[PDB]
Amino acid sequence: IGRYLPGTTFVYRVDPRAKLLTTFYFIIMIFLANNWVSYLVISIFGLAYVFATGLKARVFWDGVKPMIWMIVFTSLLQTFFMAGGKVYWHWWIFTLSSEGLINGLYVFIRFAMIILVSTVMTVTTKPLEIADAMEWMLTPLKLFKVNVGMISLVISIALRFVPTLFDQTVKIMNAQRSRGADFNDGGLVKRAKSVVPMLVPLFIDSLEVALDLSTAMESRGYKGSEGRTRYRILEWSKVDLIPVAYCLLLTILMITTRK
């Protein structure tokens, strides 16, 4: 892990499909905005999405942190819009302007909006819930050669066994740290070697688990992917009308402000 926690339990956070669609529809709705009332509209909806769904404001810093100073430079670069073309002149041409300032503030809100809607996608949903949604969006390509039975299987196992192989590594790490071992001493020719004492155990293990699982899967009567039911499915709850309204209302507001 990896994060974040599904609610403890907070209100909403239901039906990853609709919320993931709302996540994808919103980042498309982040684009297609030509006015200051456009950026006003898309700002106070994604905003209203956040604290009506109530999360502590401090949890959003974790997503913004890595991209901050580069994106400041983006917004700093485009706050200077000057001489886009026809001036390869003059002296110091670049200068502060409101046109750039409002451009630079556009890019802050245009960029930061994708780290709001998407952050609440991860925070408010289990990883399997997202995967369940992901495989549903993936479905319509069944018409092509792509069988998706094994694609959904490989995903389901990796998502399942990523936690375990992690915890097995720490155990292996501390194991070699006890009889050995120092991992940080300086060198190129030197400390590439330190990877092996964790890796071979982890790879030996990961082979040992692929053995034990493939055997159990068949002793549970796994013939193949073809045509055997499903236990775990997704519903459509009553709460799912909120994101259809929230998405459909904002549509017209964004339409007016685009044009």
Binding site: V209, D212, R220, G221, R228, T229
Partner: protein, 280 residues
């Protein structure tokens, strides 16, 4: 009568192997309804028995050797229909845990049978209830103890309704708390479904409580006797590389102290009563 009969079997690993057969002889039979123990030293080849039973492993010849889980004979396309009669609980619960949550692991077997979902809901919730895992139905294998993930491993088996439950090395990694708890549950699950159980190598109550005990050292079957029979085998059992259960060990140490007790005590109750008797 017997619920499965394995004929003369020679099985090796020929890739990579053949200094030695793993078994080369065997030819044993389990009586229907009976709890049975396959016990031996590692290298007696018992570990490979349970996999040859459901067809995952195969004899060398396929002709002179015959494996039938009674009603059905291994195997060509027979294999899959055999696995409807028999299922196995392996030793490492985390490794074989196939479900996202608890109730997806108990539904996995049903899924493979194309049982439609409305019926799957009622069979799964019933199976996790039978193993005590009701409250934990939606919990995760990562967050479950080592004895809890073998209750889910067994619960996934009750959902496909096996005739034979082979415990292969299950409780290997486990505390003696959970070991008696798991076995006590299988004992219940056994006599409410009228099954045949094949348990492998925990000794103690897993063997001393079984109706039939097969000593597999080494590669071949050493005697066949009941638990009250072969555990008194002492040296011929001890020179095998094995050991003896508590009551057999406690009556042993008592003899050297001058207390001679009848060689049929399979229990604490018989021994407690025998010491209650012998105290006048």
């Amino acid at each position: 009568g017997s619920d499965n009969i394995i004929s003369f079997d020679h099985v090796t690993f020929t890739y990579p192997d053949s200094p030695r057969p793993a078994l080369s002889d065997l030819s044993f039979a389990i009586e229907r309804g009976s709890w049975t123990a396959l016990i031996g030293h590692n290298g007696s080849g018992k570990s490979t028995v349970s996999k040859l039973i459901n067809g995952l492993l195969a004899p060398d010849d396929l002709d002179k050797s015959s494996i039938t889980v009674d009603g059905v004979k291994l195997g060509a396309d027979t294999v899959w229909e055999v696995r409807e009669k028999v299922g196995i609980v392996f030793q490492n619960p985390d490794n074989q845990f196939v479900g996202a949550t608890v109730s997806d692991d108990v539904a996995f077997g049903l899924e493979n049978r194309a049982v439609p979902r409305p019926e799957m809901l009622k069979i799964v919730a019933q199976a996790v209830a039978d193993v005590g895992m009701a409250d934990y139905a939606d919990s995760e294998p990562s967050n479950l103890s080592g004895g809890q993930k073998q209750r889910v491993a067994i619960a996934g088996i009750l959902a496909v309704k096996p005739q034979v439950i082979i415990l292969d090395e299950s409780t290997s990694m486990l505390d003696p708390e959970g070991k008696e708890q798991i076995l006590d549950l299988v004992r219940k699950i056994k006599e409410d479904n009228n099954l045949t159980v094949i348990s492998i190598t925990h000794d103690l109550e897993e063997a001393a409580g079984a109706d039939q005990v097969l000593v597999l050292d080494d590669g071949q079957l050493l005697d066949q006797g009941k638990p009250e029979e072969i555990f008194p085998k002492v040296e011929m059992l001890k020179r095998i590389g094995l050991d003896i259960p508590f009551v057999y060990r406690l009556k042993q140490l008592l003899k050297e102290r001058g207390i001679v007790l009848p060689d049929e005590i399979d229990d604490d109750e018989k021994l407690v009563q025998s010491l209650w008797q012998l105290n006048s």
